[PDB]
From a paper:
By using the actin cytoskeleton as tracks, myosin also powers cellular cargo transport processes and can serve as a molecular anchor and force sensor. The myosin motor domain consists of four subdomains: the actin-binding upper and lower 50 kDa (U50 and L50) domains, which are separated by the central actin-binding cleft, the N-terminal domain, and the converter domain, containing the long α-helical extension known as the lever arm. The active site of myosin is located at the interface of the U50 domain and the N-terminal domain and is allosterically coupled to both the actin-binding interface and the lever arm. This coupling ultimately enables the amplification of small rearrangements at the active site to large, force-producing conformational changes of the lever arm.
By applying a mask including only the central three actin and two myosin molecules (central 3er/2er), the refinement was subsequently focused on the central section of the filament (central 3er/2er maps, resolutions stated). The density corresponding to Mg2+-ADP is pronounced, indicating high to complete saturation of the active site. Notably, our data show no significant change of the helical symmetry parameters upon myosin binding, neither in rigor nor in any other state of myosin.
Author numbering:
A (entry chain A): 5 to 33, 36 to 54, 59 to 187, 191 to 216
B (entry chain A): 649 to 792
C (entry chain B): 4 to 79, 86 to 97, 100 to 150
D (entry chain A): 433 to 504
The structure:
């Protein structure tokens, strides 16, 4: 139990899955009076509580599990602000890397950053696909046990380009006189024989 | 059979918008993606347990304002082990590991709330003293 | 307050009367309370003033006799030290950080107040011994 | 080190045998994922001497059995 005047909560909306809301009158252990965007009018009928919102210093953190309140509003907000405002496309949840299609190019994949990630532990750095490739390359040394990086998502999410950069990492840090040319030159073949226009998207 | 013989590391890719607009984001698709990726379940499951895990020294670096210049001990692990018991009466909200403090969801936001209110009370003290000095200074100048 | 205190305080109060009616503005009441050794917050000052509105705060004038109950109410070591020790652990406080927090948190002050109070209190690193600064600023 | 580029869980205004296969493959992959996460946090709790009973995981074997078992 914390809800007061000047608390904030998330409320559902058909237009955007949650709206931020200012709590306008203190809670009493039955319907809540709320201020909003666009002026203020709501009273919101609890059923036999609204999701409650992380203090603004937390939001934008590198790791969605580092938030104090965990829920779909908080996650969607962190990813939205990191993507739109900070132009950061990589984020962590638990062990899972989460990657969002910036869908225009970026500097971020430069060899300088490749070298900056080498040897770093995964929590030492801001998230990047090179941090996952580097953790794989570490684990394969720490144990002989082989390592798999599983890239998954909807079509068009960027699974192929994420694999491309994950391989570019190994080929820069380990690689020497070549794999890279041949593997990347295989892509137009495998895309021709194995990709199709689906209803929702081409390729 | 190929993957179970291995150790996985996961990357989930999500597509922001259906229209190919550069670097803009649609809530309604993105939530569908983040459910289809199992991320929301992983987050809920972590929220049921002890999501937030603080190294004692990071806990100190955050909440030095909470812990009295008197109370701090010759080791900060025991210092914080005491101070948190001061701040939250019931351990069940938290756990003490070997290397980290474990917290249930929300207790960190509580600690940040009480931390910020105490920091503003300290700012009230210091600002009130400086502002009162300037008031005194101009007052005695008018008397002068 | 005794007769001697009331007489000195009234004389000072009348020195602050800029209209000749024997009165000061509400906005000066806090200044008078602070000048007499009290350290009330602006919130406390507005409370004893009755949370006045802008118009009466800027133009309504009160004599010593109406000020007096408020001064009395406002009038009635370890906390000052801990308040400075918040920003300590070598016994120093950044001038930039203290300036920023005092001008951006709480009852925000002007940069000139902070420069005036901090003058001569910072060392070559730009560090202030806050125990000495605190004793100095409380006198 | 092996890198796997696989289509994700799919849902369309119409769903057909292709989607049914894609979603069954994603059931299997996420069974693996949930077991790996569950293992990792039992091992962290053994690094930290915390009881295992606190932690649980989503079990999707009943849906794999619905699709895959005999009389599935
Ligand atoms: N990280 C990224 N940086 C820049 N452009 C990207 C990135 N990810 C995806 N894209 C763009 O989005 C397109 C679609 O993603 P792609 O990986 O080719 O499809 P799929 O993920 O279905 O294989 C890419 O061809 C590229 O134009």
């Amino acid at each position: 139990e914390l809800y007061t005047k000047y608390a904030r909560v998330w409320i559902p909306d058909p237009e955007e899955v949650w709206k931020s809301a200012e709590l306008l009158k203190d809670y009493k252990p039955k319907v809540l009076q709320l201020r909003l965007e666009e002026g203020k009018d709501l009273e919101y009928c609890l059923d036999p509580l609204p999701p409650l919102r992380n203090p603004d210093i937390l939001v934008g953190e590198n790791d969605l599990t580092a938030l104090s309140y965990l829920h779909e509003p908080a996650v969607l907000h962190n990813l939205k602000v990191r993507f739109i405002d900070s132009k950061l496309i990589y984020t962590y949840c638990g062990i899972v890397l989460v990657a969002i299609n910036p869908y225009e190019q970026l500097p971020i994949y430069g060899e300088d950053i490749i070298n900056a990630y080498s040897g770093q532990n995964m929590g030492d750095m801001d998230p990047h696909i090179f941090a996952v490739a580097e953790e794989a390359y570490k684990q394969m040394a720490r144990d002989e046990r082989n390592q798999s990086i599983i890239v998954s998502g909807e079509s068009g999410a960027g699974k192929t380009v994420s694999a491309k950069y994950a391989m570019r990492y190994f080929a820069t840090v380990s690689g020497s006189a070549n794999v890279e040319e041949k593997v990347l030159a295989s892509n137009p073949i495998m895309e021709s024989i194995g990709n199709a226009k689906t209803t929702r998207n081409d390729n | 059979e190929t993957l179970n013989a291995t150790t996985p590391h996961y990357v989930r890719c999500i597509k922001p918008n259906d229209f190919k607009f550069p670097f803009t984001f649609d809530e309604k698709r993105a939530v569908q993606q983040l459910r289809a990726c199992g991320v929301l379940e992983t987050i809920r499951i972590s929220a049921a347990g002890f999501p937030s895990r603080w190294t004692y020294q990071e806990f100190f670096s955050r909440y030095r304002v909470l812990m009295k210049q008197k109370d701090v001990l010759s080791d900060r692990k025991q210092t914080c082990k005491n101070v948190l018991e001061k701040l939250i009466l019931d351990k069940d909200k938290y756990q003490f590991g070997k290397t980290k403090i474990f917290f249930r969801a929300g207790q960190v936001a509580y600690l940040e709330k009480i931390r910020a209110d105490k920091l503003r009370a300290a700012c009230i003290r210091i600002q009130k003293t400086i502002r009162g000095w300037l008031m005194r200074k101009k007052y005695m100048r008018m008397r002068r | 307050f005794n007769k001697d205190q009331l007489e000195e305080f009234k004389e000072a109060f009348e020195l602050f009367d800029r209209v000749g009616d024997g009165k000061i503005l509400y906005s000066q009441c806090g200044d008078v309370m602070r000048a007499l050794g009290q350290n009330p917050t602006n919130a406390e000052v507005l409370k004893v003033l009755g949370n006045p509105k802008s118009d009466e705060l800027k133009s309504r004038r009160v004599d010593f006799e109406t000020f007096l109950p408020m001064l009395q109410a406002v009038a009635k070591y370890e906390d000052y030290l801990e308040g400075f020790r918040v920003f300590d652990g070598n016994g120093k406080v950044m001038g930039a950080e203290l300036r920023h927090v005092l001008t951006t948190l709480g009852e925000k002050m002007t940069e000139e107040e902070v420069e005036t109070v901090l003058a001569g209190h910072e060392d070559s690193n730009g560090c202030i011994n806050y125990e000495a600064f605190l004793k100095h600023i409380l006198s | 080190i092996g890198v796997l580029d696989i289509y994700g869980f799919e849902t369309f205004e119409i769903n057909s045998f292709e989607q049914f296969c894609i979603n069954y493959a994603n059931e299997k992959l996420q069974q693996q994922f949930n077991m790996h996460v569950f293992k990792l946090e039992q091992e962290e709790y053994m690094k930290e001497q915390i009881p295992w009973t606190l932690i649980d995981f989503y079990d999707n074997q009943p849906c794999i059995n619905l699709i895959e078992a005999k009389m599935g």
